[PDB]
Amino acid sequence: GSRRYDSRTTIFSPEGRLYQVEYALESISHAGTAIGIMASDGIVLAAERKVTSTLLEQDTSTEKLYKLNDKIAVAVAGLTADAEILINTARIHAQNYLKTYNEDIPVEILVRRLSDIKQGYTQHGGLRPFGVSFIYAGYDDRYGYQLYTSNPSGNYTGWKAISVGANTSAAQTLLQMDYKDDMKVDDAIELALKTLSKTTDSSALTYDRLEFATIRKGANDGEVYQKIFKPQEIKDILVKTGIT
Template sequence: MYGVSPQAYDRAITVFSPDGRLFQVEYAKEAVKRGATAIGICSKNSVVFVASKTIHSKLIVADSLKKIFEVDEHIAVTASGLIADARRLVETARVEAQRHRITYNEPAPVETIARSVGDLLQVYTQYGGIRPFGVSLLIGGVDSSKRPELYEAEPSGAMTAYYADSIGTAKKEVDEYLEKKYKPDMTTEEAIKLAVEALKKTQEEATPTNLEIAYIPVTTRKYTTLDEKEIAKYLK
């Protein structure tokens, strides 16, 4: 018998290959691998996000390229892959967060928002006439449990909780570095330093312009960003 090439199964999202693969979902994961690296870390008193931005031209206004998004005051998201796809998912997360707040008069649990995003990602792997989202998200925050939480949502809809995680082009190298250096009792400042060090080891140049840093502390549960001067301190 002649072997069947992947091309026979990758034209429609609803068709499995004989070995149980959905090629369009796998291609979406490849899009994530081509994106700039983003990192999320749970410290003992916050959840930290550090994201690298690819700035192709000096004519680009760097602030217009966003890689970290506020979902609610206690939840944020960073993304790698097709950022236009990420904006659609972020909007879904924001609507779900506001719906929960209005319905229950309380901030939405981080896991609830992560699951709503994962559910939407999964739907886009199941029906014809659509394509999977070409993006992975790190969703983190501090809810009423006052415990830092971090989740990764993949194009397949899979959702996994992490203490520290990365997505994007340097995921393998960064994850290996995090596994060696991460400590659950590290402070916010130590977590930021760890993420920046991991990025500096995997990219040619890290500058205040091409990095975004944000965190959500346990004390206030308020989304906080660092400006370029504050970011520069971590690059010395």
Template structure:
């Protein structure tokens, strides 16, 4: 009893309950998917909003630098703080070393910050997980999953959020590392369709991509999303 009242106290079986509660906040978040191949990285996120609500303030896709971005599940406010730090880190790297920051270094910096909030009294863990992906300066594509504990893992394809168990199962069956960017887009859409309840229209998802050809973050427009949906029915 009482072991979940402070982040600095381990339970007798070695658990930090506040971290586990933060992980549960991620599980309750909207579904986010990241996939990569040699041609680039694709992010797709589920959108939820009330009929009268604007999308401003509830974004789930963020650009860190031209060549790197994130998709998030969990508390958006927590994610914005981490994203702002990652953006500063990316620009400091350019000013200090005259080169783009690597995807791994960006992930490590994010996770170092998240880990600090698991060992200091008076704070709480970040209630968010991020899929960090992009194209490294050496043209290699990378995709990492971060955890509220500060741990991270590399993936070819991954999903987080409320629908992640079904999405990961679908990805494990359908993903192929040799897929083109167009095939990856269709894969992410089909994966979201497996987990999103109700009608699946363009207002239910967003997609962003970074290709190895131009190494630029691009958020697909509503028209491009509709064309992608139409192509699935052909």
């Protein structure tokens, strides 16, 4: 029959590990680095565009930062295609919650569902897992600013500052070195760019190789606001923080 070509993507190793998840992660480890730092008055998402050219249209490109809700956004590390499938179901989920309760979906609730979807491709169906890791940056009126992370395994955790993708080990060490609870968004923004700048496999950290987003509470309002920086906005901030 067919059993002959069945890779058996959902089984335990003799050590009790999930092969495909392990391998999926190994895949993720080569993806452009993504960092998420949570300040006291906001959150920051920074990602490095993997592979670029003079011709690559940047104003139209969005390979790592996607808006899920008006208060939640994610940074992707891994297969962009796999990411989108997951992204979209998440966007639907947020709207169903809103349609049912008339309240925006609490950040963890959305993260747990998406993680559960992933967990599934891990326990049944003979399909490969999604080669993606997410950094969720969102805000709700129950836990305020939150920063999460989920990977192919289907597990997720909360963080003050974190990175996914390539050179995480280095990036983590550096964040764990300069992160302070009292940090202000702009402090976080600066720390984020510094970290990438030091972990890049590239020569210099130019704007054309970056994607940036912030979820702050524009004081002159009383409500929270998501902002995905545009090529020029990233180019500006890059000069100011002293990376020119």
